[PDB]
RNA sequence: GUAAAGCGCACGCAGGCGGUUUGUUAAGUCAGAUGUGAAAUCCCCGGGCUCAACCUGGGAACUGCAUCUGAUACUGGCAAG
RNA sequence: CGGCCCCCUGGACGAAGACUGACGCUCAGGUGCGAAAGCGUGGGGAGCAAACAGGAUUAGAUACCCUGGUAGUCCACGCCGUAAACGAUGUCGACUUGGAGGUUGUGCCCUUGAGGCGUGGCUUCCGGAGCUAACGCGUUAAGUCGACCGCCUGGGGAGUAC
């Protein structure tokens, strides 16, 4: 059967939101619209910086955006030039004084978004998928992950009938709310069709509530 | 330096309510080419792990064989299940004249000149079981001397 | 142990003539009241020669596993192992325990982790029911692996009480080449015991005699 | 036994086989010797066609048969148990 | 092969002793016996019951069910000679760990009814080695071996044609 979105259910227990501003119903909708379009713009512009999450927090007169990338030197380019450029850009979109403060991810193989998009980038380069997923899980657990499950669905190897293939290793206890299970979904558009990948990475129970 | 040898890889199946799932059984043989040889038979959902665990099992259970100069000491006819094997020592430089299963077992055990035939079923698993036990039943001259309380040249 | 020392304890006792095993004929003095009588003339020298080997093993830093699952004699065998700082199995034998050494290591690690966790803390972080459940699992694991938590590598010698009851253990040992020292009643099959002691295996007094003598010689072998 | 295959069961002639000891016989059996088993062909060592195929010298083999002389453990015959 | 009794008659087993002295095993052809159904002649025929008659059900019921009911079922004498005639396991002999029984002999010791030591015959169920494709067999072998006989050579055609 269907399964609840693992990140969406652990928001209260172990997962922080990705947009932590506050606003009453008067300007709630347009805040959402602005931040949606700005994060989609950033994704489209940093399709090579290998960004994992774009958290957005708004002071009353300002917009603050924190990027989580595996390649900090890339997004900041040379002497922080391009980051200032895109700061001007987000200033345009939000229509608001903007500030960008990048943040790095030390274990890029331990980021469901990162490993999922890597899997998709491999698939679109026409590589046998089983190799991709098993390499990903091996790398992840070699970097000391309590567990990881990878899942690919679609016309794998240009199959006329779409199949579902997954591979789990370690512990991935979705039902335990206390578990730090990072999850993300990516899609790869090939000539045959669009292939969907899902990644769960369990990094250990978090005893002691949210904080 | 243990010589290994894959000799059979079959795909077996088992039916379940949703569908019939498939597994692979690998029958392999291992031998130091110096009178020690074992055989392994592994099962796995896919062939490489199957042959891996088959060779692992074959690394244990390696029996000893009292050959001499890369050949047997006397004709031997081992029988296992529906397969009966007949092996006979041959002159120097004749080679391994045997079926593929028997040839694998023999050449990995280290015998160099022998004549073999396989009567009955040629099912490789039973064939290798038969020939391995038959090899285990050989009797070196000094073994006979011991169990008969005589000198070896007395038997010769 | 002297023949008189055994006889008073009752080492000469054996299972009914109705229930005996064929290979035990050489070790059987005779029958009385339809009861098999074990011959101490064979029992004493074999036990002494086994004590020699046990002293040798312990004097080369050997790890000794005392084995017995009798509900009467479990505590006796456990205390016997403690008196010589040796590992022990006093509860029902687990199938393939030596063969699945890798599997047991995870259980020992879990037992060590649970005891370490209780001392370290985080039980307060766990719910009171969860902390109690962790303690119950630790207690169950201690009841399961109290003797072999400090086993380290596979043992160097085995001492077995009622070898017929513990036949899985001896089959494993022979499969590993680990020597078996066992008290073998008339109903047992003596093939699996490399140093076989034919004697009563139920009576508390004779069992304690075996264990005490073995442990004295093991401490002696350790002392050097 | 269930894959092809124990007659439904029994008696019983011919036939096949036959407990144990001693003696004799030598039929079977074994050993030796002799005679014979055409040549070619097969095999081995050589020789001649420029090589080979082919031809060819010598040998080996022809595992058989027969006769005679012995052997007597085993089977057969005879006699006594 | 099943009430009881009488008359005639076959085999088996046990104890002890005597007797003969290989007189034995198997058996192609041959001979005999041989469930049920069936055939011939003649009796007998209560119950049961192919066929058949009828009533229901059903498209139909030519079946199952119901009401009847003939041959047959029984006896005498012949004939038939076939059955999943099966343990789907030919006969005879020898040897090979155990346990629980049933039945039928028989010896010794007991104070004996009892009871305990033994020793035979047949028979049942487990199970060791061993064997078997496996199932299973397992001292009553499907184990280990001898002697002789019968039988088999892919499935149909066909146990049919002549
Ligand atoms: Mg739901
Ligand atoms: Mg065949
Ligand atoms: Mg059939
Ligand atoms: Mg048949
Ligand atoms: Mg019959
Ligand atoms: Mg004779
Ligand atoms: Mg005759
Ligand atoms: Mg001659
Ligand atoms: Mg000629
Ligand atoms: Mg020439
Ligand atoms: Mg004679
Ligand atoms: Mg007389
Ligand atoms: Mg006949
Ligand atoms: Mg009739
Ligand atoms: Mg009539
Ligand atoms: Mg009439
Ligand atoms: Mg009627
Ligand atoms: Mg009608
Ligand atoms: Mg009459
Ligand atoms: Mg018939
Ligand atoms: Mg028949
Ligand atoms: Mg037979
Ligand atoms: Mg007969
Ligand atoms: Mg049985
Ligand atoms: Mg045909
Ligand atoms: Mg006909
Ligand atoms: Zn006991």
Q: Using H for helix, E for strand and C for coil, what is the string for chain A?
A: CCCCCHHHHCCCCCCCCCECCCCCCCCHHHHHHHHHHHHHHHHHHCCCCCEEEEEEECCCCCEEEEEEECCHHHHCCCCCHHHHHHHHHHHHHHCCCEEECCEECCCHHHCHHHHHHHHHHHHHCCCCHHHHHHHHHHHHHHCCCCEEEEEEEECHHHCCCCEEEEEEEECCCCCCCCEEEEEEEEEEECCCCEEEEEEEEEEEECCCCCC
Phi and psi at residue B51, in whole multiples of 5°? -65, -30
Order of strands across the sheet that contains C35-38: C13-16, C35-38, C28-32
| Domain range for B85 | 63-155
CATH number at residue B121: 3.30.230.10
The answer to whether residues C192 and C163 touch, using CB atoms and an 8 Å cutoff, is: yes
Which chain E positions have some atom within 7 A of a protein CB?
97, 100, 132-134
Residues in contact with A29: Cβ distance below 8 Å, sequence separation at least 6, in sequence order: none
The answer to the question of residue A94 being in a domain is: yes
Partner C contacted by A208 (CB < 8 A): yes
Contacts of A69-75 with C-beta under 8 Å, sequence gap 24+, read A69/A102, A69/A103, A69/A104, A69/A105, A70/A104, A70/A105, A70/A108, A70/A111, A70/A114, A72/A102, A72/A103, A72/A104, A74/A48, A74/A49, A74/A50, A75/A46, A75/A49, A75/A51, A75/A102
- Indicate whether A93 and A126 sit together in one domain: no
Contacts of A24-32 with C-beta under 8 Å, sequence gap 24+, read A31/A58
- Indicate whether A100 and A126 sit together in one domain: no
Distance A52 CA to ligand 12 centre (A): 116
- The residues with which A51 forms a beta bridge, in sequence order, are A69
Residues in contact with A103: Cβ distance below 8 Å, sequence separation at least 6, in sequence order: A66, A67, A68, A69, A72
The answer to the question of residue A58 being in a domain is: yes
- Indicate whether A113 and A200 sit together in one domain: yes
Closest residue in C to A178 (Cα) is C126
In which residue are the tokens 């059987």 written? C28
The answer to whether residues B42 and B53 touch, using CB atoms and an 8 Å cutoff, is: yes
Phi and psi at residue B63, in whole multiples of 5°? -80, 170
The answer to whether residues B23 and B14 touch, using CB atoms and an 8 Å cutoff, is: yes
The subunits that touch chain C, with at least 3 C-beta pairs less than 8 Å apart, are: A
Strand B114-120 to C13-16 pairing: unpaired
- Indicate whether A101 and A140 sit together in one domain: no
Contacts of C187-190 with C-beta under 8 Å, sequence gap 24+, read C187/C15, C187/C19, C187/C20, C187/C21, C187/C24, C188/C21, C188/C24, C188/C162, C188/C163, C188/C164, C189/C21, C189/C23, C189/C163, C189/C164, C190/C21, C190/C23, C190/C24, C190/C27, C190/C163
Query: Of the candidates C189, C152, C188, C171, which has an alpha carbon nearest to the alpha carbon of residue C180?
Result: C171
Where do runs of H (alpha helix) occur along chain C? 3-9, 40-59, 74-82, 101-120, 128-145, 167-176, 204-223
Show residues of chain C in contact with A207, CB under 8 Å: 122, 125-126
Best probe of the C interface among A205, A206, A207, by most C CBs < 10 A, is A207
In which residue are the tokens 């700082």 written? C85
Question: Measured between alpha carbons, how far is residue A16 from residues A1, A10, C191 in Å?
Answer: 27, 8, 66
**Quick check: C22 CB within 7 A of strand E?**
yes
Q: Phi-psi region for residue A3, left (φ > 0), alpha (ψ -120 to 50) or beta?
A: beta
Distance C154 CA to ligand 9 centre (A): 79
Domains held by chain A: number: 2
Tokens of A58: 């708004």
* Angle, helix A112-124 to helix A129-142, in steps of 10 degrees: 150
In which residue are the tokens 């080419």 written? B33
Closest residue in A to C123 (Cα) is A207
Length of chain C (residues): 224
**Quick check: B34 CB within 7 A of strand E?**
no
* Angle, helix C128-145 to helix C101-120, in steps of 10 degrees: 140
Residue B135, Cβ density class (10 Å: 0-12 exposed, 13-18 middle, ≥19 buried): buried
C222/B16 Cα distance (integer angstroms): 59
Quickly count: other Cβ atoms within 10 Å of residue C129's Cβ: 8
The answer to whether residues B103 and B124 touch, using CB atoms and an 8 Å cutoff, is: no
Where do runs of H (alpha helix) occur along chain B? 47-59, 100-109, 124-136, 141-148
Strand A194-205 to A163-170 pairing: unpaired
Residues in contact with A65: Cβ distance below 8 Å, sequence separation at least 6, in sequence order: A38, A42, A54, A55, A56, A90, A98, A99, A100, A101
The answer to whether residues B35 and B65 touch, using CB atoms and an 8 Å cutoff, is: yes
The answer to the question of residue A11 being in a domain is: no
SS3 call for B1: coil
Shortest Cα distance, chain A CAs vs residue C177, angstroms: 34
Q: Rg of chain C over CA atoms, in angstroms? A: 19
Torsion of CA B58, B61, B66, B71, to 10 degrees: -20
A64/A19 Cα distance (integer angstroms): 10
CB proximity under 8 Å: A 178-207 to C: 207
The answer to the question of residue A8 being in a domain is: no
Give ∠ CA A14-A17-A22 in degrees, rounded to 5.
135
Tell how far CA C167 is from the center of its chain. 12
- Where does a domain end: A64, A85, A106? A106
Distance B82 CA to ligand 3 centre (A): 22
Phi and psi at residue A151, in whole multiples of 5°? -145, 130
A97/A16 Cα distance (integer angstroms): 25
C143/C94 Cα distance (integer angstroms): 13
- The residues with which C161 forms a beta bridge, in sequence order, are C183
SS3 call for B147: helix
**Quick check: C33 CB within 7 A of strand E?**
no
| Domain range for A180 | 107-211
């Amino acid at each position: 059967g269907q399964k609840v979105h693992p990140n969406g259910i652990r928001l209260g227990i172990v997962k922080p939101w990705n947009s932590t501003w506050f606003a009453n119903t008067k300007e709630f909708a347009d805040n959402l619209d602005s931040d949606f379009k700005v994060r989609q713009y950033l994704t489209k512009e940093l399709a090579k910086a290998s960004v994992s999450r774009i958290v957005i927090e708004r002071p009353a007169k300002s917009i603050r955006v924190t990027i989580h990338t595996a390649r900090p030197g890339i997004v900041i380019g040379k002497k922080g030039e391009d980051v200032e450029k895109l700061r001007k850009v987000v200033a345009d979109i939000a229509g608001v004084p903007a500030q960008i403060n990048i943040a790095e991810v030390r274990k890029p193989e331990l980021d469901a978004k990162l490993v999922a998009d890597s899997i998709t980038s491999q698939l679109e380069r026409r590589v046998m998928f089983r190799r991709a997923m098993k390499r990903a899980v091996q790398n992840a657990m070699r970097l000391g992950a309590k567990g990881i499950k990878v899942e690919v669905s679609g016309r794998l190897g240009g199959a006329e009938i779409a199949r579902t293939e997954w591979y789990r290793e370690g512990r991935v206890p979705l039902h335990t709310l206390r578990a730090d299970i990072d999850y993300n979904t990516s899609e790869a558009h090939t000539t045959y069709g669009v292939i969907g990948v899902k990644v769960w990475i369990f990094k250990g129970e978090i005893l002691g509530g949210m904080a | 330096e243990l010589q290994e040898k894959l000799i059979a890889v079959n795909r077996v199946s088992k039916t379940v309510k949703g569908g019939r799932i498939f597994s692979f059984t690998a029958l392999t043989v291992v031998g130091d080419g110096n009178g020690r040889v074992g055989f392994g038979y592994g099962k796995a959902r896919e062939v490489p792990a199957a042959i891996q665990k088959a060779m692992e099992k074959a690394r244990r259970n390696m029996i000893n064989v009292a050959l001499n100069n890369g050949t047997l000491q006397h004709p031997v006819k081992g029988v296992h299940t529906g397969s009966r094997v007949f092996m006979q020592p041959a002159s120097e430089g004749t080679g391994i004249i045997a079926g593929g299963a028997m040839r694998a077992v023999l050449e990995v055990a280290g015998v160099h000149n022998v004549l073999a035939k396989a009567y009955g079923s040629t099912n490789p698993i039973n064939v290798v079981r038969a020939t391995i036990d038959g090899l285990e039943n050989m009797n070196s001259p000094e073994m006979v001397a011991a169990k008969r309380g005589k000198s070896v040249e007395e038997i010769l | 142990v002297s023949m008189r020392d055994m006889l008073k304890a009752g080492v000469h006792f054996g299972h009914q003539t109705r229930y005996w095993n064929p290979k035990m004929k050489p070790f059987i003095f005779g029958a009385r009241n339809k009861v098999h009588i074990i011959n101490l003339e064979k029992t004493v020298p074999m036990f002494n020669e086994a004590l020699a080997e046990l002293n040798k093993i312990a004097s080369r830093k050997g790890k000794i596993l005392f084995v017995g699952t009798k509900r009467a004699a479990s505590e006796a065998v456990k205390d016997a192992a403690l008196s010589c700082d040796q590992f022990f199995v006093n509860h029902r034998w687990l199938g393939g325990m030596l063969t699945n050494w890798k599997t047991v290591r995870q259980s020992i690690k879990r037992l060590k982790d649970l005891e370490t966790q209780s001392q370290d803390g985080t039980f307060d972080k766990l719910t009171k029911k969860e902390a109690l459940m962790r303690t119950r699992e630790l207690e169950k694991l201690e009841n399961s692996l109290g003797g072999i938590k400090d086993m380290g590598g596979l043992p160097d010698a085995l001492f077995v009480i009622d070898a017929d009851h513990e036949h899985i253990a001896i089959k494993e040992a022979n499969n590993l080449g680990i020597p078996v020292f066992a008290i073998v009643d008339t109903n047992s099959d003596p093939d699996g015991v490399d140093f076989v002691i034919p004697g009563n295996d139920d009576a508390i007094r004779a069992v304690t005699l075996y264990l005490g003598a073995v442990a004295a010689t093991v401490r002696e072998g350790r002392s050097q």
